[PDB]
């Protein structure tokens, strides 16, 4: 057979193409995946960084 | 070339995590070794942490860890982190340990 | 009439590129305010 | 240059190491020299009294503050051997000089 | 340019020259490879090798006569070359092979002889032209499934079915009065031309071409074929361009003269302005590159071609291109608009005023098929004059950031990437 | 859909934009789930009992 | 890193000066004496940090019975240096073989590099 | 690592018995069927592990019109699994075309290997 003839992609194609159908779903879930990682690590640090604070005996003398 | 191929530094990032040749037919066994260097950093992380508050005098000992879990600021998740995650430590060691042994990784000339 | 290197600046690398270098003050910036935010910090 | 640049960091990681070290016998010299450093740090405008007292763990330097600089100084001391073998890699890429300033690439022995 | 159409419904174009010492008439269609079905690829090409056969051009060798034919994807030619004041007798013989009497070039023995010689040709292309059968494979995978994918020449696979009854069926739908153009240029003027045609009277029946179902589209995908028994490798990549009849139409054509063309071994190459080629010299990453716009009827071609030997470092070549044409969106400068419309106006008026009537006569029929009339060379000055910095960063912000490509490639491509990492060099991640 | 073209006009979304919409979501986050677990458990919290005893 | 253009440009200032050139003339004899590179068989251009692509340009447009002298004066001076000693009193560069062989090469290389960077960075005058 | 030699010697003297090629040979075919690597698209012959100097002396003494057929049925294979499915039925190996087409090259640079060592061991017998 020929190398200028493509084989059959058809059961994967979309309706008509149509640029911004894949593209604005995708980075929408590109976008959401980052704004909760970047809120998880927040608070991680912040967990930690929270324990090097007076405990709870120690303010109790104040 | 690229800056990440020239400098001494980002050459070592980029021939091991970016521009690494894969095998394209490895499965889901094959993230074990991945999960494996996470755990070690937690272990590692969670445990200085701790060694702040903690004494190791044999009247001493219990007491400091109950000081932990009572009076430190969200001292109970650091323990718990800690000791629940030497647990999950094992438990993918023995799973990567276990692929070795079922896809021959163990023969020359590995 | 030239323009201006500084070595392997530019100023018309200063056209768009120092106000994005400023949007890497514009974006990129909240990362030294938001990630304070849980020991407060409150002023501008 | 980078050779330059790395050697400068371990310099600041070494005073850092002996500071933290000297606070751990508390002798007299030791409690009134850690008073004097970590005072300094309460000029800063606007997060002057956060810092220093998130150093301290309590009000003064105490015993909060005598068992987080040992856990420091464990650690410090392994975190300098890392830069260590940074300093040989940018090193081999192009060798040592030679008390003449000019180049040796004409005169080598192993 | 002088267009005409007569009483009976033939249009005349025509370019006089009198500085020149030769003419030239033909006849165009606005039929091409585009216009055919994946079984009888390859009936324009056997047409235009039974109007240059051997007992056709001995004809007209005995009275002075050259011929020359040329096959596109959308259109065809069919010329006949004298001297200036031969033209009535480049005339009858026009007739005689397209009007008059066609049934003695589709013998049988004349057909079989072509047809071998055809299939000879196909081969050795296929097998030793490199950099033109990668761009013929770039047309075919960017266009899939619609008509602008079929080469020119045809394929070997169809060639060897097709019969003496495929060439009567083709000649019937599309080579009909109102699909053609008559041509002249060089030495002839309008009105003897026009007055020879109108003493024949020439019947000339009223058929229409067929129209097409499918409407050209583009499509992100590529092709690969590996060979590592060949000394190079050769690459070519695309995103989908301008049509003719479009208003960006001169645009796209100088934002391909900004980064322009190039070979390693020439000296006066190297020293173009051009800010691609600091970082290509440094290691040598290619031989040659060429920038391209190519427009059809429906869609088009924007991209660029290459050829390289240091077959270990052809990711660095792909993510340097990509990175330059990235500024054409955010920081083109003033002095590379100004070069590249000089470079620009060099270009195409060294195309329009060759010395050659042939290639006068192809450019001249094919516009008149398309829009009715040509554009001169003055006024299509004044266009590019009228280009600023505003209109290209309009341009590429549409086109080109962050879009869908095409490519193809041969020979030694083991160390080209994927597609998705070559897909996100299309953005810049800094803005 | 078109609501995610409104917005953003075929672009990612930005990397200071990740920023601020993280420290919003913050607040409304710990706010919506602190109100429902304390309605969830209504009658057993410390400030349901004080005010049984006055 | 300053440049070998700039120190040309002053220096030249001074040598055409005639009050300047009484002044500091003898203050950069006694300077070069003091050096002591001479005594170590070296002349003054095989001083100069060639780690630099202005510098390796010159080295290789340097005619071939050139290269194959220096090369052995930068030897000779590594050896002596390791027996801590200096050179007899006859191998020492005289003052009239200190010569700059090396500079006209630099000034070339150094006036084309300029040139690329006024024509790379160039704005139109419309 | 057994041995290819020792492979064959011991493969030789079942199927020249008789009572033991009528109970050894049902028993193999049941075990290559269950194998399943027919299924993929591959023969025998391509599984054998080629990280050693044996094995990369038969591989390049191969003709080359069956080394361009193995290296499509082994990137053949590979995409089929990430996939998680199995071929089309008509694109199976039947059990006529698996033929050991790379033993008999094996098997002569095993012998020329086992030769030299017999060589570069020997005793005089004065
Ligand atoms: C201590 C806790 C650690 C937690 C992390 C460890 C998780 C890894 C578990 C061990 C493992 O790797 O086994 C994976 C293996 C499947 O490997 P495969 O590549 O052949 O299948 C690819 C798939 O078809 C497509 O996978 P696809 O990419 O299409 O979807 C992803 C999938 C998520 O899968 C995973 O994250 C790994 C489980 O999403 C979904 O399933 C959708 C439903 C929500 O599964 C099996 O072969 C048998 C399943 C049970 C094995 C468990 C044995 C544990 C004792
Ligand atoms: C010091 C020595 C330490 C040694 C540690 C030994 C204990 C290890 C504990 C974990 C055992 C898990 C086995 C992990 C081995 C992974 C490799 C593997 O078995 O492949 C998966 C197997 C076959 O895979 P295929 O490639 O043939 O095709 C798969 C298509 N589904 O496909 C399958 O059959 C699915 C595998 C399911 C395995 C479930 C059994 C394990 C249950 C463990 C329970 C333990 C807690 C009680
Ligand atoms: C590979 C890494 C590590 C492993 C597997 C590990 C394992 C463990 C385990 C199983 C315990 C007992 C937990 C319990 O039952 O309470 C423990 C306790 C402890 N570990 Fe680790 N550890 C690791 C790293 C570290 C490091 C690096 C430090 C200190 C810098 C550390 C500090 C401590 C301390 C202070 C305790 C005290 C008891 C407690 O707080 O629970 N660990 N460790
Ligand atoms: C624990 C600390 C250090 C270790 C183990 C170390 C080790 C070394 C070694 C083995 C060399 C090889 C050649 C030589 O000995 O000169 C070297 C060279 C060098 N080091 Fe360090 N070093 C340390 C700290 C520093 C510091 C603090 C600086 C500068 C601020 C520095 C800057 C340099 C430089 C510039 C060279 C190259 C010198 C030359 O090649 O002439 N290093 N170092
Ligand atoms: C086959 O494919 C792979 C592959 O898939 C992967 C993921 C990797 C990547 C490799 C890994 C994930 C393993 C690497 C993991 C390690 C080397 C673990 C080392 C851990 C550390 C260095 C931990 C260091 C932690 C600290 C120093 C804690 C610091 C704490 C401090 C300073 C507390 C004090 C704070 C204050 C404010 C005083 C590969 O290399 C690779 O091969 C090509
Ligand atoms: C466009 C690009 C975007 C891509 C973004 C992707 C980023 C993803 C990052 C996270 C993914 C994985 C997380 C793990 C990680 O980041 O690991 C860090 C590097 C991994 O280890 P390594 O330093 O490469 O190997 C380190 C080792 O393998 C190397 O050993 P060494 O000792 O250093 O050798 C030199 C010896 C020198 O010795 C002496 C004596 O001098
Ligand atoms: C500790 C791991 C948890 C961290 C999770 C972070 C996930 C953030 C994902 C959101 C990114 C949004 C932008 C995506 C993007 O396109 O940017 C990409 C690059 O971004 C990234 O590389 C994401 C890095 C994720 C790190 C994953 C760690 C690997 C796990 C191994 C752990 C071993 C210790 C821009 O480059 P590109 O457009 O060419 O693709
Ligand atoms: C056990 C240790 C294992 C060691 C693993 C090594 C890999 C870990 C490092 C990961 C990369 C992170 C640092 C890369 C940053 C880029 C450095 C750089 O640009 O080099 C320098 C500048 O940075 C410095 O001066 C020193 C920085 C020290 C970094 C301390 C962490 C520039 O070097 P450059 O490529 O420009 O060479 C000169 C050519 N004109």
């Given at each position: 057979?020929?190398?200028?003839?493509?084989?059959?992609?058809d059961?994967?194609?979309?309706?008509?193409n149509?640029?911004?159908?894949?593209?604005?779903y995708?980075?929408?879930?590109?976008?959401?995946?980052?704004?909760?990682?970047?809120?998880?690590?927040?608070?991680?640090?912040?967990?930690?960084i929270?324990?090097?604070?007076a405990?709870?005996?120690?303010?109790?003398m104040? | 070339?690229?800056?990440?191929?020239?400098?001494?530094?980002?050459?070592?990032?980029?021939?091991?995590?970016?521009?690494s040749?894969?095998?394209?037919?490895?499965?889901?066994?094959?993230?074990?070794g991945?999960?494996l260097?996470?755990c070690?950093?937690?272990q590692?992380?969670?445990?200085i942490?701790?060694?702040?508050?903690?004494?190791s005098?044999?009247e001493?000992?219990?007491?400091?860890?109950?000081?932990?879990?009572?009076?430190?600021?969200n001292?109970?998740?650091?323990?718990?982190?800690?000791?629940?995650?030497?647990?999950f430590?094992?438990?993918?060691?023995?799973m990567?340990?276990?692929?070795?042994?079922?896809?021959?990784?163990?023969?020359?000339?590995? | 009439?030239?323009?201006?290197?500084?070595?392997?600046?530019?100023?018309?690398?200063?056209?768009?590129?120092?106000?994005?270098?400023?949007?890497?003050?514009?974006?990129?910036?909240?990362?030294?305010?938001?990630?304070?935010?849980?020991?407060?910090?409150?002023?501008? | 240059?980078t050779?330059?640049?790395?050697g400068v960091?371990?310099?600041i990681?070494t005073?850092?190491?002996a500071?933290?070290?000297y606070?751990?016998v508390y002798g007299?010299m030791?409690?009134?020299?850690?008073?004097?450093?970590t005072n300094?740090?309460?000029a800063?405008?606007?997060v002057?009294?956060?810092?220093?007292?998130?150093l301290?763990?309590?009000?003064?330097?105490?015993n909060?503050?005598?068992q987080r600089?040992?856990?420091?100084?464990?650690?410090?001391p392994?975190?300098?051997?890392?830069?260590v073998?940074?300093?040989?890699?940018?090193?081999?890429?192009?060798?040592?000089?030679?008390?003449?300033?000019?180049?040796?690439?004409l005169?080598?022995?192993? | 340019?002088?267009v005409?159409?007569?009483?009976?419904?033939?249009?005349?174009?025509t370019?006089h020259?009198?500085?020149?010492?030769?003419?030239?008439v033909?006849?165009?269609?606005?039929?091409?490879?585009?216009?055919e079905?994946?079984?009888?690829?390859?009936?324009?090409?056997?047409?235009?090798?039974?109007?240059?056969?051997?007992?056709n051009?001995?004809?007209?060798?005995?009275?002075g006569?050259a011929?020359?034919?040329?096959?596109?994807?959308?259109?065809?030619?069919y010329?006949?070359?004298?001297?200036?004041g031969?033209?009535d007798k480049?005339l009858?013989?026009?007739?005689?092979?397209?009007?008059?009497?066609?049934?003695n070039?589709?013998?049988?023995?004349?057909?079989e002889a072509?047809?071998?010689?055809?299939?000879?040709?196909?081969?050795?292309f296929?097998?030793?032209?490199?950099?033109?059968?990668?761009?013929?494979?770039?047309?075919?995978?960017?266009?899939?499934?619609?008509?602008?994918?079929?080469?020119?020449?045809?394929?070997?696979?169809?060639?060897?079915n097709l019969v003496?009854?495929?060439?009567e069926?083709?000649?019937?739908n599309?080579?009909?009065?109102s699909?053609?153009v008559v041509?002249?240029?060089?030495?002839?003027?309008?009105?003897?031309?026009?007055?020879?045609?109108?003493?024949?009277?020439?019947?000339?029946?009223?058929?229409?071409?067929?129209?097409?179902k499918?409407?050209?589209?583009?499509?992100?995908?590529e092709?690969?074929?590996?060979?590592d028994?060949?000394?190079?490798?050769?690459?070519?990549?695309?995103?989908?361009?301008?049509?003719?009849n479009?208003p960006?139409?001169?645009?796209?054509?100088?934002?391909?003269?900004?980064?322009?063309?190039?070979?390693?071994?020439?000296?006066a190459?190297?020293?173009?302005?051009?800010?691609?080629?600091?970082?290509?010299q440094?290691?040598?990453?290619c031989?040659?590159?060429?920038?391209?716009?190519?427009?059809?009827?429906?869609?088009?071609?924007?991209?660029?071609?290459?050829a390289?030997?240091?077959?270990?470092?052809?990711?660095?070549?792909?993510?340097?291109?990509?990175?330059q044409?990235?500024?054409?969106?955010?920081?083109?400068?003033?002095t590379?608009?100004?070069?590249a419309?000089?470079?620009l106006?060099?270009?195409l008026?060294?195309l329009y005023?060759?010395?050659?009537?042939?290639?006068?006569?192809?450019?001249?029929?094919?516009?008149?098929?398309?829009?009715?009339?040509?554009?001169?060379?003055?006024?299509?000055?004044?266009?590019?004059?009228?280009?600023?910095?505003?209109?290209v960063?309009?341009?590429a912000?549409?086109?080109?950031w962050?879009?869908?490509?095409?490519?193809?490639?041969?020979?030694?491509?083991?160390?080209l990437?994927?597609?998705?990492?070559?897909?996100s060099?299309?953005?810049?991640?800094?803005? | 859909?078109?609501?995610?073209?409104?917005?953003?006009?075929?672009?990612a979304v930005?990397?200071?934009?990740?920023?601020?919409?993280?420290?919003?979501?913050?607040?409304?986050?710990?706010?919506?789930?602190?109100?429902?677990?304390?309605?969830?458990?209504?009658?057993?919290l410390?400030?349901?009992?004080?005010?049984?005893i006055? | 890193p300053?440049?070998?253009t700039?120190i040309?440009?002053?220096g030249?200032?001074?040598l055409?000066s005639?009050?300047?050139?009484?002044?500091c003339?003898?203050?950069?004899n006694?300077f070069?004496?003091?050096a002591?590179?001479?005594?170590?068989?070296?002349?003054?251009?095989?001083?100069?940090?060639?780690?630099?692509?202005?510098?390796?340009?010159?080295?290789?447009?340097?005619?071939?019975?050139?290269?194959?002298?220096?090369?052995?004066?930068?030897?000779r001076?590594?050896?002596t240096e390791?027996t801590?000693?200096?050179?007899?009193?006859?191998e020492?560069?005289?003052?009239?073989?200190?010569?700059?062989?090396?500079?006209?090469?630099?000034?070339?290389?150094?006036?084309a590099?300029?040139?690329?960077?006024?024509?790379?960075?160039?704005?139109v005058?419309?």
């Open positions: 057979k020929s190398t200028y003839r493509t084989p059959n992609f059961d994967v194609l979309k309706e008509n149509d640029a911004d159908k894949g593209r604005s995708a980075y929408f879930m590109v976008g959401a995946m980052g704004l909760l990682s970047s809120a998880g690590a927040k608070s991680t640090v912040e967990t930690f929270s324990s090097m604070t405990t709870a005996d120690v303010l109790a104040a | 070339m690229a800056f990440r191929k020239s400098n001494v530094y980002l050459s070592l990032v980029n021939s091991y995590i970016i521009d040749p894969q095998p394209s037919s490895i499965n889901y066994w094959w993230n074990m991945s999960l260097g996470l070690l950093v937690i590692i992380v969670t445990g942490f701790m060694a702040m508050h903690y004494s005098n044999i001493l000992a219990f007491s400091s860890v109950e000081h932990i879990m009572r009076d430190v600021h001292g109970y998740i650091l323990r718990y982190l800690h000791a629940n995650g030497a647990s430590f094992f438990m993918v060691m023995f990567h340990m276990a692929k070795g042994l079922y896809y021959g990784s163990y023969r020359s000339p590995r | 009439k030239t323009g201006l290197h500084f070595g392997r600046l530019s100023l018309r690398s200063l056209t768009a590129y120092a106000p994005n270098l400023m949007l890497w003050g514009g974006a990129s910036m909240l990362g030294l305010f938001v990630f304070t935010e849980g020991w407060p910090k409150f002023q501008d | 240059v050779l330059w640049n790395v960091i371990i310099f990681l005073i850092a190491t500071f933290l070290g606070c751990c007299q030791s409690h009134w020299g850690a008073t004097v450093i300094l740090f309460s800063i405008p606007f002057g009294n956060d810092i220093v007292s998130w301290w763990g309590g009000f003064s330097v105490s909060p503050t005598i600089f040992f856990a420091l100084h464990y650690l410090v392994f975190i300098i051997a890392a830069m073998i940074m300093h040989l890699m940018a090193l081999h890429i192009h060798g040592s000089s030679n008390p003449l300033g000019i180049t040796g690439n005169d080598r022995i192993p | 340019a002088e005409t159409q007569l009483s009976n419904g033939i249009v005349v174009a370019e020259n009198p500085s020149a010492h030769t003419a030239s033909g006849v165009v269609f606005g039929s091409g490879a585009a216009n079905n994946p079984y009888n690829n390859g009936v324009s090409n056997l047409w235009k090798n039974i109007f240059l056969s051997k007992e051009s001995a004809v007209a060798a005995k009275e006569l011929l020359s034919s040329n096959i596109s994807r959308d259109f065809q030619s010329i006949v070359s004298s001297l200036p031969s033209t480049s009858d013989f026009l007739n005689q092979s397209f009007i008059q009497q066609k049934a070039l589709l013998s049988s023995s004349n057909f072509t047809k071998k010689s055809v299939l000879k040709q196909v081969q050795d296929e097998e030793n032209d490199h950099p033109n059968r990668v761009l013929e494979h770039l047309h075919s995978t960017a266009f899939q499934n619609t008509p602008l994918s079929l080469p020119t020449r045809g394929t070997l696979e169809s060639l060897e003496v009854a495929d060439l069926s083709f000649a019937n599309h080579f009909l009065n699909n053609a041509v002249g240029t060089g030495n002839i003027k309008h009105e003897d031309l026009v007055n020879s045609i109108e003493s024949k009277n020439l019947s000339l029946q009223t058929g229409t071409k067929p129209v097409l499918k409407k050209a589209a583009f499509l992100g995908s092709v690969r074929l590996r060979d028994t060949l000394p190079k490798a050769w690459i070519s990549l695309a995103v989908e361009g301008e049509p003719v479009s960006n139409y001169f645009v796209a054509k100088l934002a391909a003269q900004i980064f322009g063309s190039y070979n390693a071994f020439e000296p190459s190297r020293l173009q302005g051009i800010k691609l080629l600091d970082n290509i440094e290691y040598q990453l031989d040659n590159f060429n920038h391209f716009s190519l427009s059809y009827k429906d869609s088009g071609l924007w991209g660029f071609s290459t390289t030997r240091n077959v270990t470092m052809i990711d660095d070549l792909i993510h340097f291109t990509l990175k044409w990235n500024r054409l969106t955010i920081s083109v400068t003033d590379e608009v100004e070069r419309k000089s470079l106006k060099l270009q008026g060294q005023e060759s010395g050659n009537p042939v290639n006068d006569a192809n450019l001249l029929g094919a516009e008149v098929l398309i829009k009715g009339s040509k554009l001169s060379l003055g006024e299509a000055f004044k266009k590019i004059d009228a280009i600023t910095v505003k209109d960063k309009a341009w912000g549409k086109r080109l962050d879009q869908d490509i095409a490519i193809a490639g041969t020979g030694q491509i083991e160390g990437l994927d597609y998705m990492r070559i897909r060099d299309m953005s810049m991640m800094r803005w | 859909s078109s609501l995610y073209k409104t917005f953003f006009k075929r672009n930005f990397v200071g934009t990740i920023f601020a919409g993280a420290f919003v979501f913050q607040t409304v986050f710990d706010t919506a789930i602190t109100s429902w677990y304390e309605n969830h458990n209504k009658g057993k410390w400030k349901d009992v004080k005010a049984r006055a | 300053q440049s070998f700039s040309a440009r002053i030249d200032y001074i055409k005639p009050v300047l050139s009484k002044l003339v003898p203050v950069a006694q070069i004496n003091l002591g590179y001479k005594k170590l068989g070296l002349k003054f251009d095989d001083l100069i940090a060639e780690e630099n692509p202005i510098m390796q340009t010159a080295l290789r447009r340097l005619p071939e019975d050139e290269s194959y002298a220096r090369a052995y004066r930068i030897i001076a590594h050896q390791l801590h000693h200096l050179l007899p009193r006859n020492w560069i005289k003052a009239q073989e200190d010569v700059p062989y090396l500079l006209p090469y630099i000034l070339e290389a150094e006036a590099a300029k040139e690329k960077d006024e024509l790379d960075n160039i704005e005058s419309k």
